[PDB]
Symmetry: D2
Subunit: 122 residues, 4 copies
Amino acid sequence: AGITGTWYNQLGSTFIVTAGADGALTGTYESAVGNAESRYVLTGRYDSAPATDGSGTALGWTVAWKNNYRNAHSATTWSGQYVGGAEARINTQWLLTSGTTEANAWKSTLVGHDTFTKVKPS
Amino acid sequence: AGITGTWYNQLGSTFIVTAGADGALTGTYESAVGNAESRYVLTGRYDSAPATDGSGTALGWTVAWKNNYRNAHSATTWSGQYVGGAEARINTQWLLTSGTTEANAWKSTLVGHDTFTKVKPS
Amino acid sequence: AGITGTWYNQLGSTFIVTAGADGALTGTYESAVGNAESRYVLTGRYDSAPATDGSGTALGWTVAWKNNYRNAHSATTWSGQYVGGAEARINTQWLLTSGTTEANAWKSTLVGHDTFTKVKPS
Amino acid sequence: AGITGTWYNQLGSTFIVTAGADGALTGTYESAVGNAESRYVLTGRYDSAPATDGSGTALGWTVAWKNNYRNAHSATTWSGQYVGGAEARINTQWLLTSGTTEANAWKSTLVGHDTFTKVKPS
């Protein structure tokens, strides 16, 4: 429970994630709101025995932007924490790297944040 | 091939990973050499068909810092690219997130970089 | 209008800043609203001829967390952009490096994000 | 106390910087080994009473990529620590932001690292 299920960020993006008993996160990422080729494999890990003091649950997952149809030659990883209950939400920061020449290494990695909630937004 | 194998970073951390045809990354991590008290589960994704024009192969992976010995209440994700050849390496940046309370949420995430080689460092 | 003035983020921090003619940012950052021993010097840079296509105004500044009464032995740099208009704001990502040692250098840099508006939260 | 002076990274970029006794950092950056058009104002802050326990000296500075010649509608912030001695060096992580539209704001900011030494490498 808790992590398992559908999450939406505040810009029309989805991922259905199942959380395993050991600490696994596997699922998909529907980069577009719906369509079977904006969909990408997702896998990750989470603190499957988190503090009880009212801290968040630490987690991260990875998606590589290749599927059956498309390749961005790149990948994103999210790192953050899960908060349950009233405003259940996943707070993250993310890195998105592209394969580059050595020459372009330096401009290879974008950084950002993102918040997913259990209820779609506007 | 290439990616599958054992990897070392400047600080003597190690990880043994398997790269699957799909795009799966599966192995373990160790943040303190010698001992298996720092053996944690790694799962990830990589670009199973990258752009042969000389660019790196994009990938990322996650490690939840909980195993059967200790629990850290935090996870790390690595974003980066793999390069093979005589100087084979994985160059990454990473986010380390600790579960916190609303209060310390601003102190939740560590950022860094990491270069992994097939050869143990001095 | 523009950048020059008073800004607020969600957590009760303010800075007052003057946007110099040729590209300077100078001012003070108060981490606690109405608290004297929490003012620190701010210095920065911004794009003084930003585009005319809707884009934001690139900017960044720095605070070394040392003043008259306190010294954290650390520093933050904010990088982001300014948007004027009805919903004026400065969207930022920040890095916070503390002085560490060789050994502990890995755990030296906090990463995050922040948004300042001309009009207080609640 | 030896922050002021000339600094190099491996991609043949320099900055010259003067560190006042008030926490100020003023200087020039020059992404080209030589070349007036490649010069940009630099301004920052550092910790002017750093601990003497073997920790680096925390600092950061900003550069807005507009000068008397060019405008890149962006700015970099570097955050990091000065390490003196004979292996003297400034270890940083940086954030590069361009002015984007709200639409492209997600790919606004690059991340990376950089090391500077008082001596040009390879």
